[PDB]
Symmetry: none
Subunit: 428 residues, 2 copies
């Protein structure tokens, strides 16, 4: 079979598999209602894509792949059945693509994305040129039973039907396959006996095949040792915070060694593994007249993320004073999550509030920075300072600084444009 | 890298072991008994521990177990205790099919024979395929199976089942092949839900591979097969019945669709020797009152016995059909009682054996003394019930006539009886 037809090829989920099949050598065709980044891309790679579903669009295809985004009624779908042509779903196709390939499947409730990245970062440095979503295929497995990987990670499980679902999911490993599981999860460990494949554990746990000890988090970096199964030590430097990432890079490390990669690569990848965006970006330490301070840039603009960042920093040092500069993004948001903002932002030591970055929005009474500030002042955990003319920031700051202050420039508006200008000044 | 088999001696377990070994892995396994197998295996480089002892688990990675291993086993308890995975038989088998070009044959009736036919075909094509890079295998209702081709010969005693075949059909790759009998409506009715190319076969006008001009002469079948390019092939089949024709064809279609040469297929089917216990000719014997023929059949359901019957008639001119029939299971007898009466009433002489329990308790009204009666009341043939196996030879000799065809029919110990009987009659 030589021509494959995708109905609605620009939907995510499809382009990807389509591109894979395309590089494999198949002929590819499909259709969609909109011509955009995706279709133009596949298109220049050699696909034939129509715009609009039309019954003549099937000619030549041997199989036709469709999404659940496509509906019972589609002329292409409909016509295909009539013409015999095997119609298969995105899922089955993805499974197929795995069958003759060496795929690693990252599953669990938490950590899937980061682990997946951590593994790819690793295989890449290893010069393995893996494919991610050569012959290696790194993929995120989200709660699926179709995937036919050769390695499968389950980071954690946090009902009996769910339990059964995972068991079904691991069962798809080959007899010689590997399951890498978190030793620190009882649910998991309770499932081991039922697995029926080789099992590698990683964790802080007493009994971990790959054990983590003396982990310590310095600033937004993590420091720790891992004990491979033969009792050989590896001192890890992880460029992101929290034990939880230690856990995910250890699923990664675990998966990596056991396919034979040099510790050098493993370590290099992680050393240089960012959170995929603007998180904990340290702009520099600066000696000001009132002290030496670290100035860090963070994109968190929703009470939750804002929370993680503060907790991270707290654990980061342990005595440092956190002085944060926050710029609420959008009036809508501040209105909707006001009380939540008051709470989180009262978790720091000194707070300077910038005016809301409107992003397009017209101001909303009582959802602005004076409004937050007052509400915060009423809580009495922290007495905020409001700075509407950013031109003044550096000066207000220099007056409240204290030796060894961490300064978080927090938000997503022009806040990072502002903090950078603040470094430039200070640099001068 | 090490595969250990608990009770490797079993056939079904040896096959996989052997295959696993030529692949290049490293096998060990245990059995209470030494024997042909084990030495055969041991001799290829298998470490066969005669007898179960938790120490035979040395350097293994996974343990393959049959369905005959039970709760008390020593290698079992430590295995589990040592964190070594325990795999059953098929999954372990399905694994093997994965990276292979499996052709799996499935269905109600004809699996056994179809797989056979198919193997001899590829054998003849000099493909040297493995049977139980090619892998031809029989699949009995099988969802672990990852085949590149799957045949489905038929499906007859439900919706629940139907759904199962469908899913089975699915395990095929997107680019795979389903070969299904075109003359069967249920089958022909699931077609759409396949989601894969389907080729069909049979006598019916719409057959991709269609049968025409079928005539059984001697106990051989002659007929012509219309391949998809209206290209014509005349087939000589060394086995009787339209049923077998059907089987041979699905075998031909797989071969054809794989590009094999007509000459190799035609040779294959013309050279067919028959699957054991399937209209199996055990030979001619001269008894005091006739020279008779003795044939061993498996058919236990009533339709299968029917074809068997029609089959023999089609090749025994004017002569008589005598059957020794052994119902299998008390439950089945009751379910299809009437039909059993109907089909068993179509032979010239009938000897009935007692039901072969297969485990069941007797059900009142469903044994053989009850069939006999019903059958008698029908009045087409007067059955004789033979409860004391030892008396069979004698009762047989009393009713035989020169030229009889005698059918030892059934799934239970009837075959073993018949062979003993033959043995006895040879000497």
């Amino acid at each position: 079979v030589q021509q494959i037809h995708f109905i609605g090829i620009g939907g995510a989920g499809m382009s990807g598999i389509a591109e894979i099949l395309l590089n494999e050598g198949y002929q590819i065709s499909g259709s969609d209602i909109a011509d955009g980044v995706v279709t133009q891309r596949l298109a220049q790679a050699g696909a034939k894509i129509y715009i609009g579903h039309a019954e003549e669009h099937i000619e030549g295809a041997s199989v036709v792949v469709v999404s659940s985004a496509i509906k019972d009624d589609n002329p292409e779908l409909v016509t295909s059945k009539q013409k015999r042509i095997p119609v298969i779903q995105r899922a089955q196709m993805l499974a197929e693509i795995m069958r003759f390939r060496h795929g690693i499947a990252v599953a669990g409730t938490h950590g899937k994305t980061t682990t997946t990245a951590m593994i790819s970062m690793i295989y890449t440095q290893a010069k393995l040129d893996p494919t991610f979503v050569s012959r290696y295929l790194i993929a995120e497995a989200d709660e699926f039973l179709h995937l036919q990987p050769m390695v499968s990670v389950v980071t954690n499980m946090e009902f009996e039907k769910m339990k059964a679902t995972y068991v079904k999911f691991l069962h798809n490993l080959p007899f010689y396959g590997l399951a890498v599981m978190c030793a620190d999860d009882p649910v998991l460990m309770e499932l081991v006996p039922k697995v029926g494949r080789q099992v590698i554990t990683y964790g802080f746990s007493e009994q971990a095949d790959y054990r983590i000890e003396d982990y310590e988090q310095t600033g937004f970096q993590g420091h720790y040792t891992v004990i491979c199964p033969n009792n050989e030590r590896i001192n890890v430097l992880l460029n992101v915070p929290g034990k939880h990432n230690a856990l995910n890079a250890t699923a990664a490390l675990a998966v990596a060694k056991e396919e034979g990669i040099a510790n050098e690569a493993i370590l290099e990848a992680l050393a240089d593994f960012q959170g995929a965006g603007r998180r904990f970006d340290q702009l520099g330490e600066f000696i000001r007249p009132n002290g030496k301070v670290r100035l860090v840039d963070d994109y968190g603009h929703h009470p939750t993320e804002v929370g993680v960042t503060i907790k991270a920093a707290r654990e980061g040092w342990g005595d440092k004073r956190i002085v944060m500069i926050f710029q609420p993004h959008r009036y809508s948001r501040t209105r909707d999550l006001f009380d939540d903002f008051v709470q989180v932002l009262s978790q720091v030591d000194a707070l300077i509030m910038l005016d809301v970055y409107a992003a397009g929005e017209a101001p909303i009474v009582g959802a602005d920075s004076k409004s937050l500030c007052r509400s915060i002042r009423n809580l009495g955990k922290v007495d905020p300072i409001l700075v509407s003319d950013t031109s003044q920031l550096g000066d207000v700051l220099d007056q409240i600084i204290q030796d060894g202050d961490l300064i978080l420039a927090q938000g997503a508006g022009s806040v990072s444009k502002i903090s950078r200008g603040l470094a430039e000044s200070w640099k001068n």
